[PDB]
Design a protein around this nucleic acid. Sequence first.
RNA 1: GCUUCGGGGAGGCGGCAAUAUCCUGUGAUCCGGAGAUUUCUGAAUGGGGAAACCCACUUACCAUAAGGUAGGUAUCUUGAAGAAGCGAACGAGGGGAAGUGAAACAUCUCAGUACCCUUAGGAAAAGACAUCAAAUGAGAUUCCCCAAGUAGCGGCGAGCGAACGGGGAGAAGCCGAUUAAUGCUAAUGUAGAAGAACAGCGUGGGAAAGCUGACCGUAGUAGGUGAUAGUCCUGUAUUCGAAACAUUAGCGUUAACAUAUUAAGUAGGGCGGGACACGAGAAAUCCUGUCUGAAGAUGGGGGGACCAUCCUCCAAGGCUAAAUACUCCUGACUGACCGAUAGUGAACCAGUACCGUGAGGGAAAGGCGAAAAGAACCCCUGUGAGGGGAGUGAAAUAGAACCUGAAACCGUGUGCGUACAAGCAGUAGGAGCCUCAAUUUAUUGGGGUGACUGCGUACCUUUUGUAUAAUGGGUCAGCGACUUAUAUUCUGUAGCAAGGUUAACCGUUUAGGGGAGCCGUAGGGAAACCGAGUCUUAAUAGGGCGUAG
RNA 2: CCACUGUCGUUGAAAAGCCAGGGGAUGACUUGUGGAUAGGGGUGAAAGGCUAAUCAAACUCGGUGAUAGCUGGUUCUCCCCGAAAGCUAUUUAGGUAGCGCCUCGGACGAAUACCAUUGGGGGUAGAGCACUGUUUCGGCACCGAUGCAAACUCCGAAUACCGAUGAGUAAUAUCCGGGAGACACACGGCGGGUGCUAACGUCCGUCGUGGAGAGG
RNA 3: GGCUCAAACUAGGAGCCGAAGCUGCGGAUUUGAAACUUGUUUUCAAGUGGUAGGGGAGCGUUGUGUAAGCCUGUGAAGGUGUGUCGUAAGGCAUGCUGGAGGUAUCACAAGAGCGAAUGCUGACGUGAGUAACGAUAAUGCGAGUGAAAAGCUCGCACGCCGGAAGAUCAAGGGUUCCAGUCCAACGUUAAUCGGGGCUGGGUGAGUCGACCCCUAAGGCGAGGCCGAAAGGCGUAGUCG
RNA 4: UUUAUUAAAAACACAGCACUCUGCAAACACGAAAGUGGACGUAUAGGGUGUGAUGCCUGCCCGGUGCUGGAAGGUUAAUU
RNA 5: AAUUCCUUGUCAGGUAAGUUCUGACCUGCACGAAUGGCAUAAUGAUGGCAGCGCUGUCUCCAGCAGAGACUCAGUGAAAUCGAAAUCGCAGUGAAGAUGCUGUGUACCCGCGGCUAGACGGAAAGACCCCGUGAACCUUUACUACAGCUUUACAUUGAAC
RNA 6: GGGUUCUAACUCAGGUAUAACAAUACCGAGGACAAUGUAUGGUGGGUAGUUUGACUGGGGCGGUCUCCUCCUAAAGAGUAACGGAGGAGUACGAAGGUGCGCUCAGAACGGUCGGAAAUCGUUCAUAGAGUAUAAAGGCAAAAGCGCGCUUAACUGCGAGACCCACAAGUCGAGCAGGUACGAAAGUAGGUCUUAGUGAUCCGGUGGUUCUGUAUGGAAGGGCCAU
Lengths: 64, 96
Amino acid sequence: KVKMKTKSGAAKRFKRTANGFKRKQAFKSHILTKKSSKRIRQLRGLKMVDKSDEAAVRRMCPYI
Amino acid sequence: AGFEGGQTPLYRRLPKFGFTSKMAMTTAEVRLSELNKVEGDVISVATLKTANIIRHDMKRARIILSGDVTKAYTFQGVKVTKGAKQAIEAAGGSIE
RNA sequence: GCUUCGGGGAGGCGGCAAUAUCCUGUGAUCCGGAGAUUUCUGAAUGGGGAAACCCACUUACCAUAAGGUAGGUAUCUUGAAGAAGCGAACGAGGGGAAGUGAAACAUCUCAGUACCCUUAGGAAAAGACAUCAAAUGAGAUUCCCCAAGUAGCGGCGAGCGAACGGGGAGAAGCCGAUUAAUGCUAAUGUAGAAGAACAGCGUGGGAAAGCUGACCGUAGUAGGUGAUAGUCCUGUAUUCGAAACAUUAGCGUUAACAUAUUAAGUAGGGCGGGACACGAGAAAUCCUGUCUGAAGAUGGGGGGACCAUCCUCCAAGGCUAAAUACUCCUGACUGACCGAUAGUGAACCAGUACCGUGAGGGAAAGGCGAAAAGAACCCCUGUGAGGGGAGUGAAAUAGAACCUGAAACCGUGUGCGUACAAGCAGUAGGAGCCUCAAUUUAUUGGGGUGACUGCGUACCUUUUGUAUAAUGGGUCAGCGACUUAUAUUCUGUAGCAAGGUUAACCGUUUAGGGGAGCCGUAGGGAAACCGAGUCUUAAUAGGGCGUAG
RNA sequence: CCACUGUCGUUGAAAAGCCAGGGGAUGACUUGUGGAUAGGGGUGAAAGGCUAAUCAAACUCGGUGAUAGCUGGUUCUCCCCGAAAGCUAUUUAGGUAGCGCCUCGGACGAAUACCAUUGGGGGUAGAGCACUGUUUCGGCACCGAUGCAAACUCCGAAUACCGAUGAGUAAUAUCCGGGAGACACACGGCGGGUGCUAACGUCCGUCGUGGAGAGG
RNA sequence: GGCUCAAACUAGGAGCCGAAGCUGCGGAUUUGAAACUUGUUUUCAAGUGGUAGGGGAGCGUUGUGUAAGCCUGUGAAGGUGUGUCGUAAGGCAUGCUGGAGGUAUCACAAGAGCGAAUGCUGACGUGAGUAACGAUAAUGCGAGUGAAAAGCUCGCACGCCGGAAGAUCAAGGGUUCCAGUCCAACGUUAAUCGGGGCUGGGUGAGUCGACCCCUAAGGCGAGGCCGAAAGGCGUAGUCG
RNA sequence: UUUAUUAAAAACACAGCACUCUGCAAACACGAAAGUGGACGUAUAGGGUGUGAUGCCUGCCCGGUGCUGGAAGGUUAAUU
RNA sequence: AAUUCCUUGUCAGGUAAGUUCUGACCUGCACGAAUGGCAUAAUGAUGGCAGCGCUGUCUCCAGCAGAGACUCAGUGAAAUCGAAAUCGCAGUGAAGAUGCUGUGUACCCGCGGCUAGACGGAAAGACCCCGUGAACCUUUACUACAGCUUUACAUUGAAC
RNA sequence: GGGUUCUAACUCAGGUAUAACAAUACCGAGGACAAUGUAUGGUGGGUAGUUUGACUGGGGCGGUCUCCUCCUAAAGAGUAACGGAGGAGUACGAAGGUGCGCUCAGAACGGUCGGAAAUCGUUCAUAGAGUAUAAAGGCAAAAGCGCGCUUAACUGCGAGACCCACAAGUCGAGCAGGUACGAAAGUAGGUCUUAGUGAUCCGGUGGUUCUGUAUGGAAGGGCCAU
Ligand SMILES: [Mg+2]
Ligand SMILES: [Mg+2]
């Protein structure tokens, strides 16, 4: 049977929450000496996917 | 899908995170309000399977406080939360 | 077309397509079984060759002349028997693209696909654990529904994509589950046979339709018959036949082949590749070109690097039905499939005409009427073509180019307008004329025409913007473009409702059964884990995310 | 056998010819018949020539319904609403995506708009030399007269924008969701840069019209 | 056009014309509001230009059921006129033609609607009775036959070729060869003529050619070599 | 000789010249290989390249890139 | 100069007059010695320049012959084509008008000519640009591969 | 640890016999070489598959592409041009924190070398200076200049805003813990501010119980930091 395929790379970046999707933030992989400790604090942890982007996230991960 | 016109897409702007746990694939959470599908008074993983509350390949089960229990049950090999445990013994059952 | 064995019973000598001579109850034509004959080419097979031809050798017999009849003579394999070639799809195996996608492109995708090559069988392959599992363990292979677009793989891009297990179909394990004959017994098939019941009246060319009244029905929505038939014909329901041959089974028997005895150049390893969903990856497992190389039950293989423990199973011998794949074909039946530009390319003398050196490409083209009753005869004409009478027919502008007979296009006739007037040709007005009707009589109403006045630069497309001198269309007719399948989300509607719903399957089949699974009912967190909470934190603070299907 | 020149012919008598002239004409000659070399291959006294009227990779069939951000086309009717030609990004620039703008459904209910009164901040028009520069004349760099400036300001509006309060008027604003289209814009004003205060020029801002709007 | 104490200009005034604007009258429609309240009724208010595009309501067509119905030779479908009804798509009736089928209603399913795609097929226009009738070697007349004669036959004369435009072949074709008969089509006109139609006839070999014997180039090739397969090569030979 | 079908030439070829390769199972070329051509030839031969009768002639540069020879040293694969 | 841009260089010759030609100079943008240099008899349907002869090439066309064209009879195409009741001018206007404005002119219809316009026909511009189009060619672009070559192992051994 | 020799593998496109080809036998010549398979380094337009940007008053050429400052910019924000002008791709363990203290450029007068201008004294001097660096804005409570002690150039966060298509970016009181300086109230999460920058993937490193494919480990993965 033919089914919709998940974007397997989008599934690795997005996770289902109750009313949205959670995500990690960018700019934390490398180049971290020059960054202030406020930015190192506040770029750590989960954000929610933006309301303008959750349509694309739903199109990309249809089974989550 | 996932194409922004050439701008690097959102899912590739962002980092991958987490790992997938195999243990979570075989643990089933059971609500107090599903227990009306159980035949008898004993509540074990096998009994939940034959009630079809959990999938037949689930190894573990957890009973959580979602609805209410209408009769006294005997939960044998399942994990029971704090509120679920108090509600179970308020209805008159026991956990072992 | 010859013989025979069965069927059948009155016509017949295939079609276009008739005519003649004839055959036929001394049983024809026709149908079914069997046999006989069976030119030449083609595997083509005596040699050769531009297929349908040329040239032979040899044995036996007959002839006496320059031959005739019946044979034999290819190659390969196996020890006389086989093979060869052809032909649907499906199987197994040896080789194996690229366009494309990645919005470029090289890894990757396409795809082990197309194609080429080899070779089977009614199926093939696989198959009995050196298999999984980690549960109270299960117990070969194949196929279907789930698991699941999950776990993974992946320039972690585009994509690719399991398994465990659950529910089904089918079940089987052996060491001869082989092949080919023959002979019985049974059944089938290949021709056939019987097979109910309607009349009157009116209309009509014709009755099956109308009106009236009957009948049959284990037979009433069949195809025909001059219009629509249960009772007119062929049929249908039902009951049924086989001398001969085939096929399927069961049995018996024969003759061919096969019949391991537990597995070493093997398992494992180095190097290079390949296959595993898995692209070298931390990469198990399988396969092997190259180089090596055990233990052998006090042993060995696997459990996804690897080690220990535990479980499990014994490779290096062979086999094995079903459930699964397919359709060149045969039979029966079916269709919210087509109806002549459709449906096969092909309803028709089509893989034809035609085109091409060739491989190959590849059409157009159906219909009188119920019955030819297909128009004797006469007339014009050239014994032509064509027509007009006569005749036939219900009908002949149904007359053979024949049902109906649209449009483009081209005539003839009638009415009105039009030869001093400038353009998308109409429109709004409007005189006159012509013609039908009324009307107690030139007035209205309908129709045709349109002098004269006003206004007025086609349509489509594409554009900032088109009369545009931008695009497209000579015209007509016919055909020609948002589908289908699955997944998914939202909306409506219906049923059930904290529940809803089954899938494959089974089913004497839209039912009933089948609960495997899926969605909902809880979230938080990477996760373990906890749970109306949870995460972060030293924090019980703060903060994040949470608190009718 | 060839093909140098010209006329003709060019829907030809002909998909390469005719006519009149021209060259080789015992040679590296011409010609018959049969054969050989095959597609990234052949063959080539070399022009990328020729390989069946096909050649910078033949033809046929197949992969194949190649792909085509491009062009064309897209068939009945009526009712309601109704854009955009912008910003951001883009191997992007005539494509696409988020946002803006359109529509439909739901939620919400004055939170919206207009005006009056009122609380704000500003550095523009104007203006001016207090700074930075620049300019002229006089007196003796400074004094006094006198000009000018996008990147000068001692000053400084109107408007506009952000608030408050209050009437009336009004088919408001906002949020969540289904479906878009659009991201070539043009002109006339106004304020400018650019150009020549040239352009039916170009680039912004801002209004109106056209786009998608007939009528006078 | 034409205009001069304007029909120009300036400053004033009064009349009038002038749009699909506004008003009047009739009708329809969207939304909202009020009440017999799913059009059951009346009103009222605000609306009703529109491309891309979104939303809403319908028409027709083929087919299935409803339908063993209903209609239909006292005339179905289709064709072609007319009348009539609806906002439209369109419906209804009916004359003529036609001669055997059609289909109400409500559901249901679409090969469901065409003017454009230098769209596809067929038919038929315009150009236009226009260009042309294919070597400028050439014809004239008399007879004959015939429906008909420039073109056929016969005759006389004329002209052209004559290293061909005559003759014999090979190749290729395949009956075109000869006679009779016919003239629709074919022949670039007509045709009595023909390489056209139809019917008959015609090809005679020891010596000519083929076959045959022989070999060239070049093929094929018991065995043989080589190659994943397919195949490639090659000896003896065997063809050519 | 050539662009069959818009170019016939100054283009190609040519006899002649030079360089260079090749000792024969030649180099070289076709081919997967077998088998071939070179050639039943043998350095006065055969291949490749340039130049192009003939006359007079053909200067300088070995840094670059090739080619030929050399190998002291540096670096360097699989393997181990 | 088959090479020279400036450039028709300069000077000489030829002509009445010569951007070409011939000779020479050297200031060679940017000749040069086997991608040969400079010459060269003969040869060439080769390039340039100059003469004689000859001429309808021309001044400047005339006459004549044949074949068409034209008329009649027979046969009977073509491309094109939204539809046409299809005039000029000056304006206008998607910016060059038969079709719009104003105006001027014009009775209806052929035939022989003709080509100024219908941005005439013909060919989805080859120029130019664009497309994350194609092809083929090049190379010290990238990445591969054939081929050629190196070494290890195997085929592969013995003695000193 | 290299040569030399041998022959028996292997080779012969040598001779003789086997009809011919080939093979075979013998002889002869070579010979552990050659040659071939696997692996490997080099060479390799001989051959393939492809790439070779965009903006742009047509394209090419040139220039540019990200960030900061001023203007254009129409007195809120924003706002284009291949418009006009300039900077950045750093620096600093002090040039950061704090407590305390200070005030600059110039001009004139006096004074040894000594001047136009060195250092010293005086008088005016709101900044005509400085601010690591461009410009703008700012700066006396100095943000400018010294000195002592120091590590707040902290860890966990953060109400609330600004900006914004997203991804990002910016400001931030307050709370907890630890700290520095101050007698203290306090101030301090870098530097007057606005440039000094680069997503994801992949890989490395320091930590961590989170996971760990029968089980215990481990490998690998995750989380935090880089
Ligand atoms: Mg008819
Ligand atoms: Mg050709």
